[PDB]
Design a protein around this ligand. Sequence first.
Ligand SMILES: Nc1ncnc2c1ncn2[C@@H]1O[C@H](COP(=O)(O)OP(=O)(O)O)[C@@H](O)[C@H]1O
Ligand SMILES: [K+]
Ligand SMILES: [K+]
Ligand SMILES: [K+]
Ligand SMILES: [K+]
Ligand SMILES: [Mg+2]
Ligand SMILES: [Zn+2]
Length: 531
Amino acid sequence: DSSPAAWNKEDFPWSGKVKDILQNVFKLEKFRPLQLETINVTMAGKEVFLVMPTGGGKSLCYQLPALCSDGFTLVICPLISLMEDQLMVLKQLGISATMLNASSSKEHVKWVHAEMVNKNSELKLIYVTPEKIAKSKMFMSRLEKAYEARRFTRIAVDEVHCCSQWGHDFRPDYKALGILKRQFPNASLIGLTATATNHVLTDAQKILCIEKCFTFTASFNRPNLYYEVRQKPSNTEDFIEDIVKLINGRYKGQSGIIYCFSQKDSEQVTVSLQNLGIHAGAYHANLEPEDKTTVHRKWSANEIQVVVATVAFGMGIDKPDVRFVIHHSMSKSMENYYQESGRAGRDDMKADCILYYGFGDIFRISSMVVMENVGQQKLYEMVSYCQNISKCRRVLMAQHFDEVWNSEACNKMCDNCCKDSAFERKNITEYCRDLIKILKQAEELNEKLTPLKLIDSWMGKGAAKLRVAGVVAPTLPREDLEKIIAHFLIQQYLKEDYSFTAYATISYLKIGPKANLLNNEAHAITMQVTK
DNA sequence: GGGTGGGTAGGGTGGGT
Ligand SMILES: Nc1ncnc2c1ncn2[C@@H]1O[C@H](COP(=O)(O)OP(=O)(O)O)[C@@H](O)[C@H]1O
Ligand SMILES: [K+]
Ligand SMILES: [K+]
Ligand SMILES: [K+]
Ligand SMILES: [K+]
Ligand SMILES: [Mg+2]
Ligand SMILES: [Zn+2]
């Protein structure tokens, strides 16, 4: 990762053009960090990789250079939806652009092929899927003619991490993309990604073969962002009522994003907010382009205060003044949470990120991510973050990314750093043994306990057939009992057992690997609690 | 309502189980 700072200047011959395009065409005041350095390197003919979090402004770094020189820029994109979002932005800006995909008509393909070799064509950006490279010789023939005509002099590979086999959403189509630099060496190539471990970037560079390449990585910490974790109420109605209290009481009239586990959750939450007077609109990539345009148009004009998006893939939410981000359910992984929470405060002003932690959400996410190899492990790391009540959120967040060392001070910008309080180490060894007795009886009774059922037996609720006479009621609030069970599951005193039913995957709790340590009478189990 | 109508699939606040 060579230093961008040498390139953070506007003394270049093209600098006047770059400033002219940025202000007059893109209607943008100032470059965001690493934008200018990335743009200069591409205009210098050098290969560059830009690692920037989603919503950081990656797209400008190759759209602007396209307008600074004659001819068009080839953009490789993996998703049709991603291509559509860029085209809508470009169309609003008056920049000529087009796309090719498998579903594109024969006539449109003919037009795009004609425009590529056309001397006077107005096209500046052409977006194609990697399939059009690997599996269309006809498109390659036009591309070769265009290259020899100097029609196109640069290439952008969005989601460049897909080239590497280790990258998320690795695509066999992306493997073939090395043909580009081999066949068109004179065209500079730029790779854009938001999730980029260093070994992933080097592998992708090998695939493209590109040999020497600048890699610019955005700073991890966002000083203006406030990170908080709140308990999620057991019912679904006081929760939305609580959210409306937060929105009116602290962010009255301010834009914000609500993240939900599922698409139907976003629709359900959107209706609930609307009935309470909050102007809200659901957004997800499953939306038709007309729906996406209307929600984006309404949100930008502040006709809609709150956008309710889905965690799974929701990511056309570009607005510089997002004052708050609220997670209706906890993120799937810490890696996802940083991306989702990082939408807020792109204007660099103070913004709040509130995560609502719920015991039920743990198992709902666990069943979904069962096929993922590390899905449970990534989720359990997220659970640990919610559990913690003393450590600074930035320190906790940093520890989940070995790729970044963040020494920046919190400056009272998280719930734990804020709040001066004292903590003990409450013993919970007795509680763990009591839960084991309930579980052991179930195994002999050949019945599986859901976490809901297991907690019911502990408190004296539920079917009496799943009871131990000697187990006394915890005499603690139910939410506290959920945390104790969650702590045991994290520590592997309990383990999740998954049942595959026809309807859905179901999580059941079972005796964990570490329960045999309870045989030692001197063994103790403790957890942080406020005094 | 019925399970040869289907559950990589429509979803469980649609209802029976
Ligand atoms: N220099 C800048 N100043 C202000 N806003 C910017 C700048 N660069 C990009 N943006 C805005 O950030 C938003 C998100 O950028 P996007 O192209 O989605 O980046 P990414 O590819 O990282 O998601 C866009 O709406 C864009 O208008
Ligand atoms: K843009
Ligand atoms: K049914
Ligand atoms: K039906
Ligand atoms: K049915
Ligand atoms: Mg992007
Ligand atoms: Zn802190």
